[PDB]
Design brief:
This is part of a larger assembly, with two copies of chain A and three copies of chain B.
Chain A (H helix, E strand, L loop, with lengths): L4 E4 L7 E3 L7 E3 L2 E3 L1 E2 L13 E3 L5 H6 L14 E3 L16 H5 L1
Parallel strand pairs in A: 6-7
Antiparallel strand pairs in A: 2-3
Chain B lengths: L22 E4 L6 E4 L4 H15 L21 H32 L2 H4 L4 H7 L20 H4 L17 H6 L3
Antiparallel strand pairs in B: 1-2
The chains are: A alpha+beta, B mainly alpha.
PDB class: viral protein/immune system
Keywords: envelope protein, glycoprotein, Viral protein-Immune system COMPLEX
Entry title: influenza virus hemagglutinin complexed with an antibody that prevents the hemagglutinin low PH fusogenic transition
Chain lengths: 102, 175, 54, 175, 175
């Protein structure tokens, strides 16, 4: 005889669950992530100034351990201190090392 | 469904409407077909991509800070250096674990909006010219077709001129 | 390594586009404020109702 | 009453409807009776107990922390150990004194929803078959009774079949 | 325009309505004039100055704290005293820079409420006595005038008594 008119939204089958003020579970069309899950595992040499302490520890690089000569007059933006790191020189104690470091 | 509509009384899912986020379904003489909308599809997604620009990609760049992992037992200062940072995290977390709960919940009554505001639109540009068959879909009295369709589906509809079939098939027919 | 990433984590270097990261409380400059939660999904679209059997 | 309804245009309080959180009042030939609902009563309370579970009984277990009360004047660290803990309480409070404000105000436009989405439903499953007498209550043209009631009060109502009394008592009778 | 109305379907700006925040526009035989409202103009502005009293003029009075500017390099404690306060500012700010986003967005769906709850009111106290001419404005069948106006503009309107012009000029006139 005549015409019928239906109206609405739309949808999908691969919906993802979410949380809101009321439901700790709901299936919306599309949602995105807001929490950096994990990382690759390498430090980008840029855009910062990175300096591998290598075996030298900043303090030792400071004082001038027999073997940190390599790090003379150095500079940076982010000094990275390593684990395999050590000091090979007249044993010493820096009171409030923390700060002399920081 | 705060506004009601979606997952409320239009309890059906539009399977694969891919030409957008909204639209209608005409059952005219020429058969059928689910048409795509705009000022509503764009409208909603207009906003969603607004609240989000806010959230995503923005502030915070801090350089030299306080230490946070510790090699030997120091006491006090240590204790403190912790409880300060911990407290931060804790806070920043609750702030986040809600920015969502809100932004999210309201992301919803934001879509369940454009709906209850379109059917609530057609049901305006046309008087006794037709009524949402029960609920969900509509009911027409005129012999509207693919061409005739570009009426509502364009807000180009005279409930005045194109009115002939009024009282008729309604309450007028035998009973 | 050779690249770019305004954010450094003792854990590696991460992308700053998100707002939140759960990589490591220790960061360097441009970086996602650290949160306890390992994931927080945000609705980009409208709800959703199942076709058949969900 | 953001949605309007409650304490809006249904300005009367349902005294002692104990068989639920909602319902109707029929004035058929069989006298009267305030009937109790479900998909709205369980519906709202479904949600309230939802946002709540969220709030109530959850996170936070912290063991060794910083001290917070002090026996002698220390200065600096002291000052700080305070100011840190003070700042915490202070923040945590404002988060609290608003989690309420919000969850609370929206707890409302959530009840004043189920209302303005039921009258808005009856006023769908039945065409010219009747109209909400002025406001608040409805107006019927058929001689509906206790049995006939399980129509709308079950969504089992034909505005097509059970339509007889249409135009009539309406705009049809003398004037 | 969550509720839709404002900046929604009443797409016109009421230029200089100063006798209030709302009102109508009658096109009777007596010409025209834009009348001012109350239980809606006060109503809305009733709440704006409520959510506001909340924000504005309130808490926070703190005396002796931690310093925040520093003359010489001290390390550690220094670092901390900063990062403690810095963290504060940072938080309080997000707490602020949102109190707005929310309170502000919802300040809106609160104005676009009173609207869609008045037309939706006139469209209650009067049956087939008239219909919102398409959208925006209304359509009357009766010869209402400056006096007759104090009907709706007072909730003083009988869609029963003052009904005469019903079916008529509607779907009744030739077609």
């Amino acid at each position: 005889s005549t015409a019928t008119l239906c109206l609405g939204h739309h949808a999908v089958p691969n919906g993802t669950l979410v949380k809101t003020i009321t439901d700790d579970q709901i299936e919306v069309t599309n949602a995105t992530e807001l929490v950096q899950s994990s990382s690759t595992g390498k430090i980008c040499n840029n855009p910062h100034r990175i300096l591998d302490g290598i075996d030298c520890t900043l303090i030792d690089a400071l004082l001038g351990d027999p073997h940190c000569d390599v790090f003379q007059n150095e500079t940076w933006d982010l000094f990275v201190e390593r684990s395999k790191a050590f000091s090979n020189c007249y044993p010493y104690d820096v009171p409030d090392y923390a700060s002399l470091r920081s | 469904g705060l506004f009601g509509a979606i997952a409320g009384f239009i309890e059906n899912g539009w399977e694969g409407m891919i030409d957008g986020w909204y639209g209608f379904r005409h059952q005219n003489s020429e058969g059928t077909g689910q048409a795509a909308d705009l000022k509503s599809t764009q409208a909603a997604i207009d906003q969603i991509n607004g609240k989000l620009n806010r959230v995503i990609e923005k502030t915070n760049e801090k350089f030299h800070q306080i230490e946070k992992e510790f090699s030997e037992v120091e006491g006090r200062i240590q204790d403190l250096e912790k409880y300060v940072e911990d407290t931060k995290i804790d806070l920043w977390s609750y702030n986040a674990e809600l920015l969502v709960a809100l932004e999210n919940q309201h992301t919803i009554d934001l879509t369940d909006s454009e709906m209850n505001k379109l059917f609530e639109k057609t049901r305006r540009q046309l008087r006794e010219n037709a009524e949402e068959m029960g609920n969900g879909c509509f009911k027409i009295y005129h012999k509207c077709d693919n061409a005739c369709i570009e009426s509502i589906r364009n807000g180009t509809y005279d409930h005045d001129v194109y009115r002939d079939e009024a009282l008729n098939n309604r309450f007028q027919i035998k009973g | 390594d050779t690249c770019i990433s305004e954010c450094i984590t003792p854990n590696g270097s991460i992308p700053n586009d998100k707002p939140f990261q759960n990589v490591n409380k220790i960061t360097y400059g441009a970086c996602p404020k650290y949160v306890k939660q390992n994931t927080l999904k945000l609705a980009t679209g409208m709800r959703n109702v199942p076709e058949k059997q969900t």
